[PDB]
Symmetry: none
Subunit: 85 residues, 2 copies
């Protein structure tokens, strides 16, 4: 398998945060999905941001996040809004 940090949108720091949250490979990331991965990281470090949720979803979909469809961006913004608070 690829390293998490080779996936689109996932740099070294997001890879470290995923690993610290228990998500260690692309297969684990796709299994849990972006929203749940984000929440797990948030439980450790609440500085993880709306942009990093977009990055995780892009990684799951295998695309740079700028290209996410509009409905998905709005869904993820609505999720991040529900959390904060």
């Amino acid at each position: 398998l690829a390293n998490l940090s080779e996936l689109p949108n996932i740099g070294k720091v997001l890879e470290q945060d995923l690993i610290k949250a228990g998500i260690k490979t692309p297969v684990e990331l796709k299994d849990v999905g972006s929203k749940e991965a984000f929440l797990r990281i948030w439980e450790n470090d609440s500085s993880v941001c709306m942009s990093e949720l977009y990055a995780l979803e892009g990684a799951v979909q295998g695309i740079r996040w700028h290209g996410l469809d509009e409905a998905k961006k709005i869904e993820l913004k609505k999720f991040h809004q529900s959390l904060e608070g």
Copy 2:
């Protein structure tokens, strides 16, 4: 993407960037954080280290909190020099 969809860029920093002629993420990457910071600082010298870190983190696609230590020190040296504290 909009500027305010990039990591660390709030609505007010997006407005400051636009006012300084930096209107898109591509335009921000093209000029980089130090030039973008100078442009906003020229308009408002109250912008400060926080904004510089935010801008570099935006360029790198990461929360500023994750910037490498070398980059953070590089940015601090630049900011200190701008604000009247060059190294001796």
